[PDB]
Design a protein around this nucleic acid. Structure first.
Ligand SMILES: [Mg+2]
Lengths: 129, 52, 51, 175, 112, 187
RNA sequence: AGAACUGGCGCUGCGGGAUGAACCGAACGCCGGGUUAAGGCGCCCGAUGCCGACGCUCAUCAGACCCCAGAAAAGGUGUU
RNA sequence: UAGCCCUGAAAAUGGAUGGCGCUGGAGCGUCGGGCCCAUACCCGGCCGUCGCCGGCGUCGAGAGUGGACGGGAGCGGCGGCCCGGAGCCCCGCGGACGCUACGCCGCGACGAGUAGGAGGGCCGCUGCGGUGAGCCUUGAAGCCUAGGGCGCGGGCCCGG
């Protein structure tokens, strides 16, 4: 751990298994993106046992632990120096990401501004030479 | 009839000074009373047999 | 909600008489226990004094 | 009634309420065999309503105690009178048992009516139970234990399996 | 009486019920009456300002039984840990649905 | 399940206005401080009236106000209306009463200010009487609209008096059968 | 095939009825511990591997659990 | 007379107390002590909805469910020679967090759902006005990926 973020609790999650669409195994035209089944007879909507679960608000995560990374921070993706400085009074709570378009020259500079301000960047060594 | 003999009994408690409680109540459970089996002893009855 | 009847001193937060009710039924059931063990020995004491 | 467990004899007395017409009704008495006192004062209003014009609303019970046999150690011979119902009609019945207590002899009836006659315990009405002395028994199964210097052995004893090792190297003698 | 079991409770039946599973309502909330202030602040109008005074009106059915009862939330008891018998026929008939007149104290101690 | 019946869980009143007026939203913030904090019931009436719609805020004319302030006792109180004060042409001379309202119209506040009265907004009402002491809060005829005379039983029921939707008043527009005993019937 | 009264299914999963639309329990946010209902506890199959109580019954077509999935009159010195 | 059994009692693929089997019972009748487990019930966690509300006092000087002064008379108390009197803080110049008020906080109860109806979407696609002193040949869009995550989800972000 390069940096330590205030109090990090035991992150419990209710499920770690990524809800899939019904019949998404059987076809490849059907993406695994969740669509709730609204057929009149099917056994997922009617909620039989031993079948594909369907998401509801009971699976929601704890409010004090929501959007927590496994490192204990919460990401905030930035593009340059001028919006890295807005995270100065949040550096023990939030962490910065560099957006995927930022060129390897400018990405080199906004991580050296991050080290002076002691803000955690999740991807410091990306697009190096 | 009750309204009539209720209002006159209401002002009877003003002159006499009481708490007569003119509101009516349902049947309470029976009071803890006392029976008397004076002299004799209770009658043994037993179920009669079946004859058609 | 800590449980009355399961700890003291929540009973006593809700009922101050409950303590003085309680050592009375510790004091008197100990004096009925000192009585009966002394009495049951005193029966077989003289019965053993006989033999 | 379920006849749940061993029964328990109750003496139940009770009387219909004093009307303005009738003061001090005579306070009848029955002899209810029931597993507890709540069933026992429930069968009183079953049997009294078939015999007198009384019911639980216009009556009350004025005693319900367990009445128990005086001699729990002495072996007694009981003869009881039955009024069970069958699948076709209903029959009167005399029937003899042999137990150390009255409620144990009528318990031995309800089991025995269900065994032999398949008669469920709500359909059978006990009329009267009393001890009889010997040489007035008529049943030769009860009569055959009236024998001074009686003796018999216990042949072919079988019990306690799985209690010991289920797997043993030992064929268990039945004596 | 097909749907209920009831009977006449003795003194430690209500004493165990009011303390252990007893809850009160003030306006719409089911609160734990863990203080004698909470009984007095609402129902103190009737002079039943403490816990063991509340337990007295509700056993010896007194003048203000109604407002002392309706202060209480319905007692959300647990499942009876001895098991029941048949749940559908009468207690006389062998089951347990109906009046049983003192055996409800034996049932509360499994429920409560 | 419990059987505690449904539809008792939800109430269907308003907890903020649906307006995006940034001057009504600060009047809301002023009064929902005063509602939950000063313990006077005037500030609860005025607060839920700021939430109300435009139909639930009918205009109050100039001679409903001064007819409702010729009454005995109203000689020095202030008139609150949550909504506009228009002016009547019917009234000839205006007393010197003190009013307090959202959005008094142009010709009305020329006649209130010639009379010597004082018009107030709800800011300087709140500084004046925070409890709402000595105010006569008025309302307009909220069932005075042209829409409410179309509502009722039915226009073709017995004694309906409901005024049906015709596209143009005149002869031969909904007047033939059902409206006279010669042609058909009369309801 | 058609009515009445209440519930249900349709819209509704779960435990039990081997299987099941409606029967019996029972209604559902996502979990941990506790306990039970209806049902059960030889082995599939969680729990009688209790030194369970009392009787009844032998079938060369035994019998075995609401709805519920097979039977009657008549007869039997077969036993009780 | 009525319990169990038997006779009465015959159908087409091979077959059904569910099966295997079961006869001091794994059968029938009447019962007892245990024991087994539903998403039900009880206690606890967490999400959400609904209901009743809370804080504009950031008031480390704010303090108030009764409040001042200044006079007519009395004490108990604080400094006696029985005469007696407002001190505005200061040796420390100090004292967390907060409140997008459309935000935050707290308590309590509840959560099935086809057709249908509403709400929220910092879910998504294309185009416009504004706006990021945005991003980019030191590599955009797209496409690929046993790479790393977040979101209950629609989805999104990051590495290669
Ligand atoms: Mg269907």
């Amino acid at each position: 751990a390069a940096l330590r973020p205030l109090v990090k609790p035991k992150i419990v999650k209710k499920r770690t298994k990524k809800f899939i669409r019904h019949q998404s195994d059987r076809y490849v035209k059907i993406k695994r993106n969740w669509r709730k089944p609204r057929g009149i007879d099917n056994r997922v909507r009617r909620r039989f046992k031993g079948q594909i679960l369907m998401p509801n608000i009971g699976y929601g995560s704890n409010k004090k632990t929501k959007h927590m990374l496994p490192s204990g921070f919460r990401k905030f993706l930035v593009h340059n120096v001028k919006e890295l400085e807005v995270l100065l009074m949040c550096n023990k709570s939030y962490c910065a990401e560099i957006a995927h378009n930022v060129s390897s020259k400018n990405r080199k500079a906004i991580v050296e501004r991050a080290a002076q301000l002691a803000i955690r960047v999740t991807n410091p060594n990306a697009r190096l030479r | 009839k009750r309204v009539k003999e209720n209002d006159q009994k209401k002002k009877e408690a003003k002159e006499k000074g009481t708490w007569v409680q003119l509101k009516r109540q349902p049947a309470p459970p029976r009071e803890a009373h006392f029976v008397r089996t004076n002299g004799k002893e209770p009658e043994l009855l037993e179920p009669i047999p079946y004859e058609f | 909600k800590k449980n009355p009847l399961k700890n003291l001193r929540i009973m006593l937060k809700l009922n101050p008489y409950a303590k003085t009710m309680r050592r009375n039924t510790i004091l008197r059931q100990a004096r009925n226990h000192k009585l009966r063990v002394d009495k049951a020995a005193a029966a077989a004491a003289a019965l053993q004094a006989k033999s | 009634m379920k006849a749940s467990g061993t029964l328990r004899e109750y003496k139940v007395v009770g009387r219909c309420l004093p009307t303005p017409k009738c003061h001090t009704p005579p306070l009848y008495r029955m002899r209810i065999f029931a597993p507890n006192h709540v069933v026992a004062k429930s069968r009183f209003w079953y049997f009294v309503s078939q015999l007198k014009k009384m019911k639980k609303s216009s009556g009350e019970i004025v005693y319900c105690g367990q009445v128990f046999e005086k001699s729990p150690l002495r072996v007694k011979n009981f003869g009881i009178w039955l009024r069970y119902d069958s699948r076709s009609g209903t029959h009167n019945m005399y029937r003899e048992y042999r137990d150390l207590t009255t409620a144990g002899a009528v318990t031995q009836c309800y089991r025995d009516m269900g065994a032999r006659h398949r008669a469920r315990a709500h359909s059978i009405q006990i009329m009267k139970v009393e001890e009889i002395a010997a040489s007035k028994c008529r049943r030769p199964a009860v009569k055959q234990f009236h024998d001074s210097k009686i003796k018999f052995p216990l042949p072919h004893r079988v019990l306690r399996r799985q209690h010991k090792p289920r797997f043993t190297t030992k064929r268990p003698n039945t004596f | 009486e097909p749907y209920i079991a009831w009977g006449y409770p003795n003194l430690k039946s209500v004493n165990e019920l009011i303390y252990k599973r007893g809850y009160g309502k003030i306006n719409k909330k089911r609160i734990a009456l863990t203080d004698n202030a909470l009984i007095a602040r609402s129902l103190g109008k009737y002079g039943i300002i403490c816990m063991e005074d509340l337990i007295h009106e509700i056993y010896t059915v007194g003048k203000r039984f109604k407002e002392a009862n309706n202060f209480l939330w319905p007692f959300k008891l647990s499942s009876p840990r001895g098991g029941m018998k048949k749940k559908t026929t009468h207690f006389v008939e062998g089951g347990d649905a109906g009046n049983r007149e003192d055996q409800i104290n034996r049932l509360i101690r499994r429920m409560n | 399940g419990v059987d505690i019946r449904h539809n008792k869980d939800r109430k269907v009143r308003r907890k903020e206005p649906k307006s995006q007026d940034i001057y009504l939203r600060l009047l809301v913030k002023l009064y929902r401080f005063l509602a939950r904090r000063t313990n006077s019931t005037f500030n609860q009436v005025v607060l839920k009236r700021l939430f109300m719609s435009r139909t639930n805020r009918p205009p109050l004319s100039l001679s409903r106000m001064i007819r409702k302030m010729k009454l005995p006792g109203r000689e020095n109180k202030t008139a609150v209306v949550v909504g506009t004060i228009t002016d009547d042409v019917r009234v000839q001379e205006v007393p010197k009463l003190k009013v307090c309202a959202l959005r008094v119209t142009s010709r009305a506040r020329s006649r209130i200010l010639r009379a010597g009265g004082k018009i107030l907004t709800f800011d300087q009402l709140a500084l004046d009487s925070p409890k709402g002491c000595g105010t006569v809060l008025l309302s307009g005829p909220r069932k005075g609209r042209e829409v409410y005379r179309h509502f009722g039983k039915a226009p073709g029921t017995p004694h309906s008096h409901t005024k049906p939707y015709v596209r143009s008043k005149g002869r031969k527009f909904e007047r033939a059968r059902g409206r006279r005993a010669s042609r058909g019937y009369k309801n």
